[PDB]
Ligand SMILES: Nc1ccc(S(N)(=O)=O)cc1
């Protein structure tokens with residue numbers, strides 16, 4: 001029900017804040033995502049482990065014209081700030097939205113969670129090119145190739161198998177990276193990348209047809225914790 | 227920007243609607259002040275905040291919202307490796323920030339701007355105790371009427387108002403008065419300094435009302451300690 | 452092991468030479484107690500030390516070196532993921548540890564052993580203030596003569612002696628009495644608890660002398676905070 | 677002037693504490709080195725950067741029958757606990773003395789420093805097999821091949837070039853790893869390894885003729901900071 005937006009032309013990221021009054025934060029926000037994570041500038045901090053309690057409740061995969069998204073049943077959760085944030089969906093960007101020390105990864109997954117009070121936590125996972133990713137291949141095998149199309153998953157999705165083994169992370173306070181770019185979003189960005197094959201990357205690039213990362217936004221007053 | 231205050235239909239709950247320019251007061255999710263729950267704050271390797279103040283006070287002003295000492299902007303603190311220049315300091319009673327749900331009777335804000343206009347506020351809490359000598363210099367020329375500036379009669383050394391121990395809480399927040407712009411660095415010192423009850427009462431009476439904004443939800447933020 | 456004490460030719464400086472068994476008192480480089488300089492201590496992600504004590508006091512003994520409450524060893528704390536069982540607790544005046552070069556008037560040590568004989572000591576500082584109810588139960592049966600045990604007349608709840616805030620300094624050290632064995636985990640709580648001046652004075656008079664070992668050099672160690 | 681010791685037989689590490697009363701700490705010490713560094717058990721902490729102010733004041737290389745050691749003039753220093761510890765010598769062990777998560781590296785360098793008050797700080801650098809190490813090759817080219825022999829260095833030694841680029845470290849309180857195994861030694865163990873070629877490793881192994889690492893010792897009451 002929100003105004004139409006995209007990644008280029010008159011509806012691209014530089015214009016989002018003018019597409020609708022609902023999208024104001026895109027242009028006036030000072031706590032926007034994604035960001036560059038400069039590891040030296042980040043603050044070493046006593047960050048609590050982010051406990052993962054996922055379940056295999058995937059409903060379908062959808063190509064919504066902005067990403068490839070797996071929609072979940074909402075029963076699995078992570079624990080952040082002692083609260084349960086339930087896994088609602090995960091989706092993908094290429095190139096990465098976040099950068100580390102000024103460099104992109106070729107691909108980034110976002111696991112989007114909602115607590116019962118309506119607050120959002122996103123877990124970000126970077127991918128590098130290497131070995132074929134078995135869990136990703138379950139989704140890729142049935143990737144809808146046109147926008148507006150959804151497909152049944154033919155294999156049981158285990159979302160935790162997409163996360164890195166090492167669970168060290170960067171944390172900061174940010175926003176959604178797509179309109180309305182609402183703030184008050186908790187970001188948990190895992191430091192260790194996972195792997196996907198070049199073929200998997202190129203399938204995503206070909207199906208999408210364009211890059212779908214928002215440009216990095218100024219840190220402003222924020223510190224990233226590490 | 228419209229007239230605003232601390233009670234009635236122009237009080238803090240109404241701010242965001244008084245002018246479109248004040249919208250962040252209502253819609254922002256990284257607003258100040260906050261309650262600082264010490265147990266919930268995250269232990270972090272925070273850099274010392276070095277202070278290089280000079281005695282460049284220009285005047286004291288009662289602007290109807292606070293008593294404010296305006297500076298020449300030559301002194302500075304170092305935050306994130308950058309110089310933030312001390313433009314003014316001013317006061318609130320009761321405190322704006324709380325610690326573990328409790329107010330201090332009084333809080334001072336030292337407001338700094340870097341060369342690109344980014345704002346850093348250093349907050350100092352005060353408790354009732356011995357008369358504060360440095361504060362006494364400002365109080366001796368406190369203008370009793372809003373809209374009046376008075377010249378200082380003594381040399382102001384702003385660093386003498388800060389606590390001796392320089393450990394602090396840090397978080398990202400906002401200005402505490404309209405337009406409540408975000409992108410503000412907050413450095414809140416953990417150790418309070420003392421003022422006499424008479425110094426406190428003079429401020430309370432000259433203001434004529436409490437001038438603290440209610441604490442705002444932390445939302446996605448952590449406080450570092 | 453030879454007779455040792457807190458003054459004359461059997462005092463702390465002479466300990467290491469009284470018996471070959473006491474050599475570490477003299478040659479060890481990770482000895483306790485220490486001065487805890489808070490500014491020098493390293494901020495660290497220290498695990499909470501969970502306390503699971505039970506009321507299993509057996510007796511109070513004056514052993515000529517301290518007043519000690521001997522426990523049944525059923526209660527425990529969790530340190531490094533392991534259970535360390537509370538064997539006894541005892542007292543020193545003035546404090547053994549100092550903080551920023553200052554003593555507290557009194558310090559309690561809660562001595563624990565894991566299943567393999569590794570020792571963890573929890574230290575609690577006391578300041579003069581209100582009479583301590585839990586300490587009063589022990590004091591009511593304090594044996595006045597060395598070599599005497601007395602039974603308790605009230606149920607001892609040792610956790611009631613610990614401060615409410617459980618934040619602590621940690622370092623690796625030694626026993627503070629001969630043979631001053633190393634390999635001892637020290638958990639020193641930052642917040643003091645209160646005792647009356649009369650409770651303090653009773654202990655000082657029953658002992659008849661100061662029973663604190665002088666602080667020892669940190670050498671290669673850091674204190675975590 | 678101390679009693680003769682070695683790495684095997686009746687004079688090996690299990691016997692060091694009985695070889696001389698001077699070596700007592702080898703058998704009774706509870707703060708001995710080297711150790712296993714379990715990264716999960718280590719405590720994340722606000723460790724100060726260890727500033728390096730080395731100079732090229734190498735005097736000679738020596739094969740002393742226990743290691744290959746480069747002896748320095750003592751003018752270069754590192755800063756630890758706000759004090760200058762001067763670089764006196766550096767030397768090598770294979771396999772590594774320290775282990776990380778129960779695993780050895782094939783080689784470890786130790787840079788030994790002395791403050792003016794007589795306190796020792798050792799910086800440890802792990803090596804893995806990979807590319808030929810240019811700074812190490814300056815020493816290796818003139819490695820004395822028999823115990824008791826010293827040789828002139830034919831190239832200017834720059835000791836800082838042996839340290840890893842990333843200067844993150846583990847710190848703990850320990851001992852010398854050779855008799856007398858004196859305690860009160862500050863250990864700074866860099867987390868990131870550097871590389872040496874297989875040929876460089878095998879030259880060291882061949883010249884030494886035996887492994888020269890002391891077995892790891894119990895952590896006891898200690899925490900390692902990271
Ligand atoms: N609704 C929504 C959820 C997550 C994101 S993202 N790309 O920031 O994770 C954007 C919109």
Ligand SMILES: Nc1ccc(S(N)(=O)=O)cc1
Pocket residue numbers: 335336337347400401402403
């Ligand atoms: N301009 C301005 C400066 C500082 C503050 S305060 N009250 O947050 O320090 C508010 C407005």
Ligand SMILES: Nc1ccc(S(N)(=O)=O)cc1
Pocket residue numbers: 560561562572625626627628
């Ligand atoms: N055995 C023993 C137990 C504890 C201590 S103390 N004083 O270090 O707690 C000394 C000896």
Ligand SMILES: Nc1ccc(S(N)(=O)=O)cc1
Pocket residue numbers: 786788798851852853854
């Ligand atoms: N003297 C000496 C210095 C350093 C070491 S070592 N191997 O622990 O660095 C041993 C002895």
Ligand SMILES: [Cl-]
Pocket residue numbers: 046047048268
């Ligand atoms: Cl946290």
Ligand SMILES: [Cl-]
Pocket residue numbers: 493722723724
């Ligand atoms: Cl340090």
Ligand SMILES: [Zn+2]
Pocket residue numbers: 091092093110177
């Ligand atoms: Zn996304």
Ligand SMILES: [Zn+2]
Pocket residue numbers: 316317318335402
């Ligand atoms: Zn203010």
Ligand SMILES: [Zn+2]
Pocket residue numbers: 541542543560627
């Ligand atoms: Zn004791």
Ligand SMILES: [Zn+2]
Pocket residue numbers: 767768769786853
């Ligand atoms: Zn060595």
